[PDB]
Design a protein around this ligand. Structure first.
Ligand code: SQ8
Length: 265
């Protein structure tokens, strides 16, 4: 964290993207390069109880160097406000891109494959994302797919063993299975229910299945991820060779059509 430089001289703050975790996020410009950045501004007096979680996400992101994890550029302290600088991904989140209408299975498989490449990276680095969901998957304007918003070390994407506070990288594989349902259907299982009910339903019930006129390989991909027994879930490495992925995923550049569809909607 840079406690001497003035982030307001280094960056031009533009429109708010939204309210992410801990603080508000803005599109911005690096005044030296003119590249577009994402800027999170956290009021450290308002958000004092969460400061250690902020620090640990900074540490984790600063240790990542992968095409599949959103790039971290640094942090700055100005008066009471912490500025966190990340690369700007102009395609939006996968959740955003569901808005115009359903994805097809080529788009689903392509997005899951890229998520799996990021999970393979993280798990090989002995890291766990802990919040895989469509809202935390960001696309560049070119269709590149990257992970953002790591979870801290809402229940709908949580593995049962995380809820029972009993976990390792296989929790991410469960969340990936929920995310696969989300990309196919628009919403995770139990999305109509109160979160406190979902908290006991996930451990209690059989795992969700993908319901609808979807290919059997896609239903099998979901079922493989959504086993109650973590040791029965496959690794990310193994899932990159799943027949659903191999038979349906195509070049990421094709996802620009999905980004364009969202702009015309
Ligand atoms: C739309 N394009 C876009 C959005 C971004 C970011 C990059 N491109 C980067 C971020 C981003 C994340 C974490 C952090 C961060 N937090 C704590 C500690 C360390 C950190 F680096 C900082 C930033 Cl700038 C971002 O919030 N959005 C918006 C966000 O997206 C995903 C949603 N689920 C919610 O909205």
């Amino acid at each position: 964290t840079n406690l001497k430089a003035d982030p307001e001289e280094l960056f031009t703050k533009l429109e708010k993207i939204g309210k992410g975790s801990f603080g508000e996020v803005f599109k911005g410009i690096d005044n030296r390069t003119q590249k577009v950045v994402a800027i999170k501004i956290i009021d450290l007096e308002e958000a004092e109880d969460e400061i250690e979680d902020i620090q640990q996400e900074i540490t984790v992101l600063s240790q990542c160097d992968s095409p599949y994890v959103t790039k971290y550029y640094g942090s700055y302290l100005k008066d009471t406000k912490l500025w966190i600088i990340m690369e700007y991904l102009g395609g939006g989140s996968a959740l955003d891109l569901l808005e115009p209408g359903p994805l097809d299975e080529t788009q689903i498989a392509t997005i899951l494959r890229e998520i799996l490449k990021g999970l393979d990276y993280l798990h090989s680095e002995k890291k766990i994302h802990r919040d895989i969901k469509a809202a935390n998957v960001l696309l560049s304007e070119h269709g590149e797919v990257k992970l953002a918003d790591f979870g801290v070390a809402t229940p709908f994407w949580m593995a049962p063993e995380v809820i029972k506070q009993s976990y390792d990288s296989k929790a991410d594989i469960w969340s990936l299975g929920i995310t696969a349902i989300e990309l196919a259907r628009g919403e995770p299982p139990h999305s109509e229910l109160h979160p406190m009910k979902v908290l006991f339903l996930i451990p209690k019930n059989n795992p969700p299945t993908l319901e609808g006129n979807y290919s059997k390989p896609l239903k099998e991909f979901v079922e493989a991820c959504l086993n109650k027994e973590p040791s029965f879930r496959p690794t990310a490495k193994e899932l990159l060779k799943h027949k659903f992925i191999l038979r349906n995923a195509k070049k990421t550049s094709y996802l620009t059509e999905l980004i364009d569809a969202h702009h015309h909607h």
